[PDB]
From a paper:
On the other side, M(NLS-88E)-acidic has monomers A and B associate in a face-to-face arrangement to form dimer 1, and has molecule C similarly associated with its dyad equivalent to form dimer 2. All three M(NLS-88E)-acidic monomers superposed on each other with a r.m.s.d. of ~0.5 Å. However, least-squares superposition of the two M(NLS-88E)-acidic independent dimers 1 and 2 resulted in a very large r.m.s.d. of 1.2 Å, indicating that the two dimers of M(NLS-88E)-acidic show significantly different dimer arrangements. Dimer 1 of M(NLS-88E)-acidic is more like M(NLS-88E)-neutral dimer (r.m.s.d. of ~0.6 Å screw rotation angle of ~8°), but not its dimer 2 (r.m.s.d. of ~0.6 Å screw rotation angle of ~15°). Dimer 2 of M(NLS-88E)-acidic is significantly different from all other obtained dimeric structures by showing neither apparent contact between Asn85 and Arg134 nor apparent inter-subunit interaction involving Glu88. Dimer 2 of M(NLS-88E)-acidic likely represents an intermediate conformation due to incomplete transition after the pH drops.
As the most abundant viral protein encoded by the M gene segment, matrix protein 1 (M1) forms a shell underneath a host cell-derived lipid biolayer to connect the vRNPs with the viral envelope in mature virions. The full-length M1 protein includes 252 amino acids consisting of a highly organized N-terminal domain and a flexible but less ordered C-terminal domain that are linked by a protease-sensitive loop. So far, only the N-terminal domain of M1 has been structurally resolved at an atomic level, showing that at neutral pH the physiological monomers have a high tendency to oligomerize via a so-called ‘face-to-back’ arrangement, whereas at acidic pH the N-terminal domain exists as a dimeric structure in a so-called ‘face-to-face’ arrangement.
Residue numbers in the entry:
A (entry chain C): 2 to 70, 76 to 161
B (entry chain B): 2 to 71, 76 to 159
Amino acid sequence: SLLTEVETYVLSIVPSGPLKAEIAQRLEDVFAGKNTDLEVLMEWLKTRPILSPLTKGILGFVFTLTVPSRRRFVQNALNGNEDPNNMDKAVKLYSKLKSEITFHGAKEIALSYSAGALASCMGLIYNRMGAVTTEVAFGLVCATCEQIADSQHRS
Amino acid sequence: SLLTEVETYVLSIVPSGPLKAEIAQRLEDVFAGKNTDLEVLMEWLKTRPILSPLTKGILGFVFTLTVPSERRRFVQNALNGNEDPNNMDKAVKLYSKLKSEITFHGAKEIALSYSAGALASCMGLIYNRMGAVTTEVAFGLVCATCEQIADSQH
């Protein structure tokens, strides 16, 4: 059910703790439409401990996307590197997602790319949020999160 | 000097005014460090008739590079425009190269080898990523752009 799928790919990369609680709550809040001030949330997010800049960006992005009403700290994190090759393949991924309509198609083709590219793709979409349907944008964030979580593992 | 080089290329893509003169007057004004608040200017630029949106956005870009008060949806909409794939591809590539340029004439000569839609696309990237390129190089870009746009007009 849409919310529950981004709610569990996003919540995934967030390190276990109390922060995990508040974020979930703000997630299902805005997903309902309860408390929709984006700058209220952005302010809270920017100040948060534990969360890497990237994680903050993915979260910013999602929030920006789920609200009905742009921050540098988000933008900087997704773009990071600005590695010419991640970028080149961000642009290639992006063009494919323009033709996409569903969360699942977007998600599937996104996982055929690198973590660097997906971060980059998001940094392109952040400033072009309308350029892709909402399901497809989420499918990007979820794919991004998923691979972040296919690295985080032991031995 | 660069500030007047930029000027002539900008006025190049604006029809005879004399809103044109209101514009030439405002570019000169900021370039001499006059009393200039970016918002008031952008607001005044947004509103303007006659000026096609792309023109507003090149202007806006140019002001952003030259006025203090430290984004604008209409400037961004003008430059990114369509948010079109084969233009972004060429613009991203141009973008990384512009990071490496240090001069005005270096940027200008590179950029003029790419197409105008890509050049507008790249100004979009740089407007979004404001400090990633140097002002001299950014100026080499807008002039590159204005030269392509204007030598298409005939």
